[PDB]
């Protein structure tokens, strides 16, 4: 399993991008609900009411049952259109947030993948350190048994051996935790991963910070989100200001009513004013409403919206400054990493020379096995440091590409050419 | 009227056969199959395991270490099959950006209930069951979920 | 003051748990407000209106005073029942949050209590180092005074002494800040705590990770909260779908009215059509309402609720993965802590052997007082490290118990058996 | 450019205090909207409706056009006054938040200003170290070429030189990042900054912690904000309890109506009951409404408000405890800073004495150039540490001033008297 | 109608006697007692002081270090007793999950005011005084609150 | 009726002459002047440049390094002058606590358009131009904003 397959699996089963996608879908679906008031509304409603007279209308009772089908529809109301536009802009900013989440997922899976290799190298170094320290302790015990040193030296050697045993346990647990983090981020267990290739790995100079700034000015996700938020704030100003405008609706209604009268007074000489009525009305009409002075209300709302727009502009400026600073820092990090890579490579060469010196002396007869074991420990430490620096450089490339807002799986595909050989991640298998 | 555009593109790569669809529908069908045939054999359940529960269960059976787990029951918190099952309700699923949907199933033996929980994933174009987490007192054996129980 | 009494005092007076309890009580009280609309609603309302006619109704004036007592009650409206169920589920999740707050309070008080002891040990070691360094500086000054070394050695010794003095001041301030944090947690000042017992302290192997995972599956608080949130999301789906159904209300009213007429046209030949009326009604009625197509509205709301349910399911899956990772990490943490304890114990033994050798050499005549002082300093450092490791092991046991969502004072009772010897906390009393 | 001008420029153009100022202004402006419902509300509305009869009213059609002007005004409604008071208190707490933002801006600009000087000192030390290490490597290469050492020593020297080169690159990037952070805070590029003056710098013991606590109790911003929040909670209790009171409104209206009848039965023997009417009404009236039992409603809301008040009181107590702990910590921090300043000064003196010894030995003829180069490197390291400690002491003084809530530019004026000599901040200038 | 079950169980362990109850009520009673008499003694104020203020003030009196503070006015920000007091209202306390209730009592001497602050705690079943925060300009002496003033 | 008191006090120190005011208004008059006279000279544009773009541009011209940038166009993302300009509206600015207002200016040449962006700052009592950030594809030259293009 290399980085490409790991990321392909992670993109599928990861319960952090699915939630953002669902939130995006809900925000996009809200457009229909925002547009719903514009569409015609209609309903049906029936009722039945019995009334009993009192005082002057003594002995008068009525029973009226009504059923009305109503259909209302607006004609000119800018508030609904403004709300629809606001919902559209909110959906856009939510989509921008989802894109940002995708970029963070890519970065997270890359970092979690490289942590496992770093832990593997650390454990491999710790195993050699343990072997060398155990041989040193055995040497000290032999010298004491023959008799050349005091008991304090033996106690110190045993203390150092116990310390290295604890360090080995800590490194093993670190590897286990790294594998568990990878499983948490991918929802799968990986028993073997692709490791770095020494020959295929080359470090290239980054493009000038001027081009980086030029691309990040117009392609960064945070800047686009801030600009869209400012546009939404302006639309909010306009929607709040639209409270001065009048409104106009049209209604239609078909109503059927059935009324019956009873009581002592009705059962008399009323003749025509007290009779059961079977009424039917197909009411159709318009309605116009123009609000006038309502205290502060709309004026205060406009002032508040203007202040909110000012705040949004300040947020946009702050976002631009932060983006510029982030781009500059991420550009400097790459050069720092290149220098660190060169230094660690030279240190590895020196450690190899020292190990060869110890081996030659041991073969000739001027050295012991403990010396070559310590040289091997130092060489392993240098190798681990160099590998960690290389992984840091590879991560810094992705950080540079993410600062510009142009991170996608093509970068991972390009990076995948440096991972060639498989290595197991079982702590017992790598170091029994 | 507008229609939402699904965030994801494929959400697929399904190998084995699978049932029509519906998360609660698929879980209820699985439990009905379990109750109807009292064999609880793995190979007849293949259209219900996803792509990895099948191979994990096959390798566990061939490993000759989890015989007692497999014989009694692998898919429930109790060694004996239940009398009735009621899978929780999920009111449909829009588009295709939906995985890892767990449902709390309520299983009833003779005046008993354990309320297990099953995972469900899409993995292609249908709905499929995965994991199962033994969410009941007096757990059958091993630990936690079935995958944690049979993983090495 | 051992751990149990400190925890009891902290539970009694802590302005972080009281706010959580108040929020829980408010959430539980909201059930009554949510259920109130189901209960009958009655009111009383009176008014008086004077009307003056115009145009065709010239010289016509009316004065009408009305007073009505109304009582309304909803017969069938399941939206209110769904809201009541939603409020109940919210109260349940708030209670789960309160339980989590209790657990974190226990963890915090234990951590502070052990931090104070660690600070005490560090201060003791620092003052031992101060004594050794001062004796070394005096030795160097004497050697220069008789004349055996250059002035640079004296300057270096004075620099070491000043650095040690600054370190002592820093350690004293650290102890003071630890006591201040304990007071902040518990709202009380403790000039006396209980120290660890070395004879009664033993390290026991933890239970297998499988049993821990099995317990944490069904017993963890975060998992329960996520499951309850998913259930609430399902209830929200049902509440959104409830909008399709019709509604039915029952109304009753008792009203009195008194109307009088005046004006030029009133004082005419109307006779029976323009007179003062003392009218009274006892109305009882039923109302039924069936909403029909309203644009998207309810359909879009149902889709939004379904998307929210999908998001809640994603949250549940993420919570389960995080819980599993946390339990595994804590198990590995305690496993490493055991080995750290063993290594530090061996280091303490070696340091004691070195100190005994130095003391024997000083007694015989081959060593000076500075050598045994440095040996004592090293022994004190080893003792402090071992004690800190023991406190870390106890805190890791508490973390193991907390990850399963089963933390309570019964674990503090078990920890209390290892705290026997009282110790003062005043910096001057323990470190003159 | 000293600290004062930098702070003035930062206060002028900082896109994080303007946002808070705009938010505070919006909160203050919302008072008008809150008071708006109290003021009279008047409007104008017209409509036109055509009705067609059915069933018993067959062949009856009507056309009615109405136009009304309405003016309503609440005579007694305590809820609006309660809302106005609530808005006022919210504006007050927002103003307190703005003051806190001003204080944190002052602190941030001070820290970012001192970071640049620290970076300059580190870069100078690294340049000296690079010179010394290069000379050592050249000496080793000369020794090998003549033939005195093995190749392993040459490899080790080259490795150390490469490590020093990487360290120099890192220090240069750190200085660049510090300058970029200053630019982000202040929105300007500063190519020259006033450096610390050692003649005018002195350390003074602070006032006793008792006086600090006495001032901070009645002057801290967080405590005032918490107290105002508790008062707002009490006002919320009263506003919720105000639901029992009745309400009184005054209404006036002037309306005209034109109605016409036609269709069939109108053109009959009705005579006057079926005729076009031109109605005009000048209506004036009152409206009294007294709510009665509404289920739980107001009682449950009162209980909820009381629970919220309890929570606010708990928050106030927690804030007081945190303030006390912060003041104590700051006092101890400044004491430790002075104690560390003394030790670093002594270390600088010792390093200077060692360098003078090395230089005298080199002049006489007992030492090489590499020895005096290493002595200069050590002296530079000590100088950098002392300067960093001095900057930390100044920042601690500012922190103590801020903990009391009395931070303003007058303290920056006092700090400015210790910054006299300007230094360029170009990495190429300070270290080609 | 349902009720709310209190989160806590005991919230007690009270030793000395106390006034009936009511935070604002108890504060008003304390400030009425302090003005009705003009002695400002400690032993007769035990029902109001809770459990730690009483012993702390007794030890402070026996210490003979805070005589000047204990004489003039330990419970107020001014060395002289006020002409009138008005304790901020608090409309009842539901159930028993409520401690640390701070109140800003408004005191008034001759054409002056300081608006000090006091604390209410339950400690059993009554309400009792704590701290007193000295929230007036030109405070009496020492520092901050009474406890910070007299603690060692 | 009440009024809001501005949080700031000075927001000033303007040296050079400046136009009446209005952020969108000033940004529109700047483009109107630039199209009206096809010279595009920095000496007569001083009322629009704020206080630092003026000196920065003067020193860039005197530096003899940015000849190509200063020749074609320094204030737009395209090497040639636009055909029409439209400044994004801002419905007035209350009081005086407002600077750093960015406006997305929509330029249109022959059947094209790139939608640059400018900055409005107060610096005294009026509104003046700043930055200009080249927010369009196929950027003219250098990098990002004009200030980053001409800074050292």
Residue numbers in the entry:
A (entry chain C1), C (entry chain C2), D (entry chain C3): 23 to 454
B (entry chain P2), E (entry chain P3), F (entry chain P1): 19 to 170
Authors' own words:
Tripartite efflux pumps are essential for Gram-negative bacteria to expel a wide range of toxic compounds, including antibiotics, across their dual-membrane cell envelope. Among these systems, the AcrAB–TolC complex of *Escherichia coli* is one of the most thoroughly studied. It comprises the inner membrane RND (Resistance–Nodulation– Division) transporter AcrB, the periplasmic membrane fusion protein AcrA, and the outer membrane channel TolC. Structural analysis reveals that YbjP, a previously uncharacterized lipoprotein, binds TolC in a 3:3 stoichiometry, bridging its protomers at the equatorial domain.
Cryo-EM density reveals six AcrA molecules beneath each TolC trimer ([Fig fig2]), yielding a 3:6:3 stoichiometry for TolC:AcrA:AcrB. AcrA therefore forms an elongated hexamer that bridges TolC and AcrB. The trimeric TolC, which contains six HTH motifs due to internal repeats (TolC repeat 1/2), engages the AcrA hexamer via quasi-equivalent binding: adjacent AcrA and AcrA* protomers interact differentially with the intra- and inter-protomer grooves of TolC, respectively ([Fig fig2]). Upon engagement with AcrA’s α-helical hairpin domain, TolC helices rotate outward in a left-handed (counterclockwise) manner to open the channel, and enables small-molecule substrates to be exported through the fully assembled complex. A comparative structural analysis of TolC in its closed and open states reveals a striking iris-like dilation mechanism at the periplasmic entrance that facilitates transition to the fully open conformation ([Fig fig3]). Throughout this conformational transition, the transmembrane β-barrel and α-helical barrel domains maintain remarkable structural rigidity, whereas the coiled-coil helices undergo dramatic rearrangement. These helices pivot around the equatorial domain, undergoing a 27° rigid-body superhelical rotation ([Fig fig3]), which constitutes a major structural rearrangement. Notably, YbjP remains stably association with TolC in both conformational states – the closed resting state and the open activated state ([Fig fig3]). This persistent interaction suggests that YbjP serves as a structural scaffold: anchoring TolC in the outer membrane, accommodating conformational changes during activation, and functionally compensating for TolC’s lack of intrinsic lipidation.
